[PDB]
């Protein structure tokens, strides 16, 4: 329902649970460039990805060729730095969400450009260690499919 | 802040990928044998994974022992038998939500003992596959914790 954006996306697993996160949700997925492994790559050809699931993806160059092509009507961002939770804002159609890579944040040059309002964090307890890329990924995704009623789902 | 069960993952990865949610969230988890790996396998302790986030873990030989030593006051099944979906459910202190193998589902033997309001389902779009353990296991903490206010998260 939303769009999703991998910024500089690194592991070729994560991605590949991603697409499949994406097609189950109906999340329309975006890829910004470089990613750490070409599209044709095996470790995620092989993940045992369904082809189906591609191509309702689209990459993007550059993070500004992304603004100029996709022009989201609010972009918010996945940040250990953000304050207000994953769960605390209120989606809305025409948003999309931003994730950093696997191994850093997003780039404080993009966050800085941002209110702090769309800059959201999943929570942890004290002490905790970086959560897998596709399990804050598919956190979010589901607590947005949630909040906007889960259009598009159905049974067995 | 509640307990999580993994009726005999397979996967040693996916399992450490669930070891570190249950630690960043302060949920209890449990594993009910047999596991498809040996709890000293390699591809989950060199995972990345610190010990501290192990030891909180328990092990339990059949699932009848898991009734007998924690005696849940409500046990929830991930299915994809289920009808109400994963945040269409009132959790509360003293839930047990169990998963799946990665391959397969809980048995019908088991499921056959529950009431319907118990067995829970991450909503899918039309024809959609498999979603992976961790990935399932992420999204319905975080959303059981959402429920809960995420009672024992801090910031950075």
């Known amino acids: 329902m939303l769009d999703i954006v991998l910024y500089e996306p690194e592991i070729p697993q994560n991605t590949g649970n991603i697409i499949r996160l994406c097609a189950n949700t ?14 044709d790559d095996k470790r995620l050809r092989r993940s045992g990805l369904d082809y ?5 993806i689209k ?24 304050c207000p939770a994953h769960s605390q804002v209120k989606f809305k159609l025409g948003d999309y969400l931003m994730f950093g890579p696997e191994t850093r944040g997003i780039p404080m040059s993009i966050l800085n450009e941002m209110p702090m ?12 260690r970086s959560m897998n890329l596709s399990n804050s990924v598919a956190v979010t995704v589901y607590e947005a499919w949630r909040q906007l009623g889960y259009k598009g789902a159905v049974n067995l």
């Open 26 to 39: 109906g999340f329309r997925l975006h890829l910004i460039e470089p990613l750490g492994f070409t599209w």
């Open 52 to 56: 189906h699931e591609f191509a309702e």
């Open 59 to 82: 990459r993007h160059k550059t993070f500004e060729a992304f603004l100029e092509s996709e022009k989201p009507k609010r972009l918010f961002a996945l940040t250990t730095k953000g």
């Open 117 to 128: 309002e769309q800059k959201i964090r999943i929570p942890m307890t004290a002490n905790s």
